[PDB]
Every structure is written in structure tokens, then in C-alpha cells.
Amino acid sequence: YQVPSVALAARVLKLLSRHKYRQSTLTEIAERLGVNKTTCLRVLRTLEREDFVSYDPQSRRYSLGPYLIPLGARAADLNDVYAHALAELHQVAAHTGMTAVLVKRLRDDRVIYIGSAEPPGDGVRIAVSVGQQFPVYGAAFGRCFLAYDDESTWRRVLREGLKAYTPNSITDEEEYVRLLQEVREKGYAVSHGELWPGISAVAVPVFNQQNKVDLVLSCLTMTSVIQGEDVERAVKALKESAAKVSAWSG
Amino acid sequence: MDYQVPSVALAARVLKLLSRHKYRQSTLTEIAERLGVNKTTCLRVLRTLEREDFVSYDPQSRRYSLGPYLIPLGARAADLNDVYAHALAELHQVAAHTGMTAVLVKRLRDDRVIYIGSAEPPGDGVRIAVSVGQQFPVYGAAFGRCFLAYDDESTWRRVLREGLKAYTPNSITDEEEYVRLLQEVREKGYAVSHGELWPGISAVAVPVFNQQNKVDLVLSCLTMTSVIQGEDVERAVKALKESAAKVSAWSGYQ
Numbered sequence: 102y103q104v105p106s107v108a109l110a111a112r113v114l115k116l117l118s119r120h121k122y123r124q125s126t127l128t129e130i131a132e133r134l135g136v137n138k139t140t141c142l143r144v145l146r147t148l149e150r151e152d153f154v155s156y157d158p159q160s161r162r163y164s165l166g167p168y169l170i171p172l173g174a175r176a177a178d179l180n181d182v183y184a185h186a187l188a189e190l191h192q193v194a195a196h197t198g199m200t201a202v203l204v205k206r207l208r209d210d211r212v213i214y215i216g217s218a219e220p221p222g223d224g225v226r227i228a229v230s231v232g233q234q235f236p237v238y239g240a241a242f243g244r245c246f247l248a249y250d251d252e253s254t255w256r257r258v259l260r261e262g263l264k265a266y267t268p269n270s271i272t273d274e275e276e277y278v279r280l281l282q283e284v285r286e287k288g289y290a291v292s293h294g295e296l297w298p299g300i301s302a303v304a305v306p307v308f309n310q311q312n313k314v315d316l317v318l319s320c321l322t323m324t325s326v327i328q329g330e331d332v333e334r335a336v337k338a339l340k341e342s343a344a345k346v347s348a349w350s351g
Numbered sequence: 352m353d354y355q356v357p358s359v360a361l362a363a364r365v366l367k368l369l370s371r372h373k374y375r376q377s378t379l380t381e382i383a384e385r386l387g388v389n390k391t392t393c394l395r396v397l398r399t400l401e402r403e404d405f406v407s408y409d410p411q412s413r414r415y416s417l418g419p420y421l422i423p424l425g426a427r428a429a430d431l432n433d434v435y436a437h438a439l440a441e442l443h444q445v446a447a448h449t450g451m452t453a454v455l456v457k458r459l460r461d462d463r464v465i466y467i468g469s470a471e472p473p474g475d476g477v478r479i480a481v482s483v484g485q486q487f488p489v490y491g492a493a494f495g496r497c498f499l500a501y502d503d504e505s506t507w508r509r510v511l512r513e514g515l516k517a518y519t520p521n522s523i524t525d526e527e528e529y530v531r532l533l534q535e536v537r538e539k540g541y542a543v544s545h546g547e548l549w550p551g552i553s554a555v556a557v558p559v560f561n562q563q564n565k566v567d568l569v570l571s572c573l574t575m576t577s578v579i580q581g582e583d584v585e586r587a588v589k590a591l592k593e594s595a596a597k598v599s600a601w602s603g604y605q
Contacts, residue, residue: 173425176417232423
């Protein structure tokens with residue numbers, strides 16, 4: 102079963118976390134979600150009374166509300182796995198000088214940025230959109246998820262087709278399979294401009310109790326600046342952090 | 352109201368419950384009994400939330416918990432408008448409903464407090480303005496008593512032994528009176544001062560609690576003493592409490 106209104110409440114919240122829809126009128130939400138204005142408004146008003154959504158009558162725009170702040174903080178700190186993994190991002194960033202990210206496998210072959218940490222102190226930083234979703238196959242993290250799946254999950258997602266985000270996105274199914282073999286041997290993956298042009302990443306799987314991968318830790322930097330020593334550093338930090346997070350997955 | 356959707360209200364109650372340390376890993380029975388809702392009704396909502404990753408389920412122990420999608424929602428919500436921003440917005444509501452200047456006070460180290468935001472009531476004419484950044488002693492006036500009343504009594508005794516400084520003729524410097532005033536603030540949930548820091552100025556204040564049940568923030572209303580009337584103080588207490596309850600929930604109080 103599915104309760105249609107609760108599912109609609111969730112879709113609204115997910116829509117309002119995208120930058121384009123961070124402040125959206127009723128009509129923009131209805132249109133984007135494909136439901137009539139009255140059904141949306143009912144949900145939005147119930148969500149508003151609980152402070153899950155906020156409403157600015159001066160702009161007639163709805164946004165994510167204040168109650169999600171402590172709710173999200175608690176979802177992090179009440180769970181041993183998430184509390185330690187988010188703390189580890191700060192470790193990774195401080196020791197590598199790269200922007201560190203936690204990626205999480207969702208239902209329907211999607212993944213999501215759960216959090217990030219930017220290196221401390223000053224300078225330009227690379228910043229990611231926290232809460233952005235991605236296909237489970239994309240860039241360095243995609244291969245960290247897929248390399249330890251049973252081939253029941255390999256083939257279904259390969260068969261759907263691989264989107265070419267940039268000219269270096271891996272869309273050849275055979276090349277992708279060889280790279281998955283490579284991830285298993287080395288325990289990490291590197292992408293150069295596969296998702297965003299000029300961005301490279303290093304990713305490492307965090308193993309759950311089934312030897313499977315629900316969480317990936319990632320490091321991000323500019324492709325033009327990355328040297329071999331940077332990859333090695335990122336791999337050590339990420340691997341060490343990953344092993345501490347796996348420890349808590351009991 | 353016809354725009355009130357009971358299944359989404361229950362989803363919210365479920366998530367608020369799972370955010371309490373005690374109920375962080377809760378069986379279906381414990382959830383349904385604690386909320387006073389039929390277990391089947393609960394299952395459908397829980398499983399719907401689980402499908403969207405707002406809740407998780409552990410098949411071993413049969414317990415539900417806050418799901419991981421709430422983490423980036425929280426971060427994106429705060430990034431747009433953080434708690435202090437929302438607190439300021441609620442102060443403008445208070446100012447509008449009371450016709451008083453509303454003020455957000457924060458505790459510092461070393462027995463000081465500081466104004467971190469204000470909201471003058473709407474319209475044109477005169478009004479009381481305050482300096483964002485002004486610091487005061489933690490014992491001073493209505494807002495001082497709202498911080499102190501909720502510390503251990505050992506702090507009351509320390510602050511009292513170290514001397515209450517008399518700013519005006521209406522300042523409370525009698526130790527037995529100040530203790531009685533702290534006790535009653537703790538009994539009643541608000542404080543009122545009449546010319547204790549500034550001649551002519553009255554204050555009504557209410558504490559904001561956080562997730563360790565401590566008072567880091569106080570919401571306060573300033574008005575002129577000489578024009579306060581019957582229902583005014585009563586009305587401001589009621590508006591400040593409605594606002595402080597909300598901001599307490601946003602600071603993680605439960």
C-alpha cells in the first residue's frame with residue numbers, strides 16, 4: 102500500500118529542496134507534480150501547520166520549513182552510522198584539501214548527496230548541492246555502488262541506457278563492465294569530468310553487513326589541479342573513513 | 352478545515368516521535384500506542400514514508416527510525432532560512448499582534464546576554480528602537496530572569512552573591528525578592544519588568560528551550576510603561592508563548 106496524500110507530501114518536499122523550486126507558488130507546484138491545485142493546497146496547508154513548509158504571503162511562495170532543521174539533525178545524530186559518517190566527511194576534507202561528500206543509495210536506482218564538508222579555512226571551494234539526486238550508475242560513486250551488486254541489478258540498469266552527461270561520461274556497456282571489475286580489485290574509483298566538466302572525484306564504497314554498498318564516500322576537486330599524490334591521499338582518507346563507518350553498520 | 356489532511360498530519364506526528372532519543376528505534380505497536388492511533392492506520396503511513404526514504408525499517412528488530420532523506424532536507428531548509436531567520440520572522444508577527452517592539456535575546460559566556468535581532472511594529476509613527484549588538488548582564492530585567500530561572504539554583508546563588516547592580520530605583524536588588532521572582536518565572540513560564548533597566552520601559556519575556564532543555568534564547572517585547580493598559584500585557588504573554596513554543600520546537604525541544 103501507499104497513502105496517496107503522504108506520497109504527495111513527500112514529493113512536494115523533494116521538489117522544494119531543488120534550487121529552481123526553493124520558493125514556489127501553488128500553481129508552479131501543481132504544474133510540476135501534475136496534480137490539481139486543490140489537492141496540492143490541502144497537502145501544503147497541512148504541511149504548513151506542522152512547520153514542514155513555510156509560506157510567505159507577500160510572494161505567495163512556499164518553501165521548506167523550519168521543522169525540518171531539527172528533524173534532519175536528529176536523523177543524523179540518532180543513528181550511529183549517519184552521525185559518524187558525517188563527522189568523517191570533515192576529517193576527509195581537512196586532510197585531503199578536497200570537498201568530501203556522502204552518497205546514499207535510494208529506491209528506484211537513484212542516489213542522493215546526504216551531506217558534504219568543504220575544506221576548512223579560506224580559498225575557493227568546490228560546493229555541491231546537498232540533496233541532489235543522481236542515477237545510480239553515474240561517475241565515481243555509481244561504480245562504487247554497482248561493482249558489488251548481484252548481476253540482477255547490473256543488467257537492469259545497463260539495459261535502461263546510460264545518460265551521457267558530458268563527453269567523458271561512460272556510455273559503452275562493455276567499457277563500463279571492465280571498469281566495474283577494476284573497482285572490485287582496487288577498492289576505489291576515479292572519474293574525470295564524467296558528470297561535470299572540470300570536476301574529478303575519488304570514491305570508495307562503505308560495506309554494509311551483506312558485503313553490499315548502501316553508502317559511498319567521495320572526494321571532489323578540479324581536474325586541472327589533481328596530481329597522482331592527490332589521488333593517493335584521497336584514497337587513504339576515504340578508505341580509512343569507510344572502514345570506521347562499516348564498523349558501525351552492525 | 353477542509354484543507355486539513357489527517358494522513359499527512361499523522362506522518363508528521365510519526366516523524367516527530369521518532370526524533371525523540373527514547374523512541375528512535377520503535378516497533379509498530381509502541382508507535383501506535385504512543386500516538387493513540389489504530390495500528391493499521393500507522394502501518395500504511397509508515398510504509399509510505401519508508402518507500403520515500405523518510406523512515407527506515409530494520410527487518411531484524413522490527414523497528415522504525417528516521418530515514419536518511421530528512422538529512423538533506425534539513426540542510427536545504429536551514430540553508431534557505433535558518434532557525435534565527437525564522438525566529439526573526441515570528442518576531443514580526445508578535446510585533447504586529449502586540450503593537451510592541453519585539454526582540455530576540457541570546458546568551459553569551461561570562462554572565463552576559465546580547466540582542467541579536469528586533470522587529471518594530473508595522474506602520475508609521477514613533478516606536479522604541481534597540482541596538483542589535485547591545486550586551487547586558489544575565490540578571491537584568493525580564494529577559495535576564497528568563498535565562499536564570501532555568502539554571503541550577505547554584506547559579507542563582509553565585510549571581511546573587513556577586514551583587515545585583517541597581518540601574519534604576521525600580522531595579523530588584525533585594526536577594527530574597529529576586530529568588531522569589533526567579534521561582535515564579537519558573538512556575539509561570541514568563542517574566543515582566545517595569546523600568547528595571549530603562550526608566551519608562553516595560554518588558555515581557557518568555558524563554559526558548561533547545562534539545563537539552565536549556566535556555567539559549569529569549570523572546571521579549573518592549574513597550575512604554577506609562578501607556579500600558581488592561582489587556583496589553585496579557586496579550587503579549589500569549590503571543591510570545593505561541594511564538595516561543597514554535598521556536599523551541601525549531602531548536603529541537605520536545
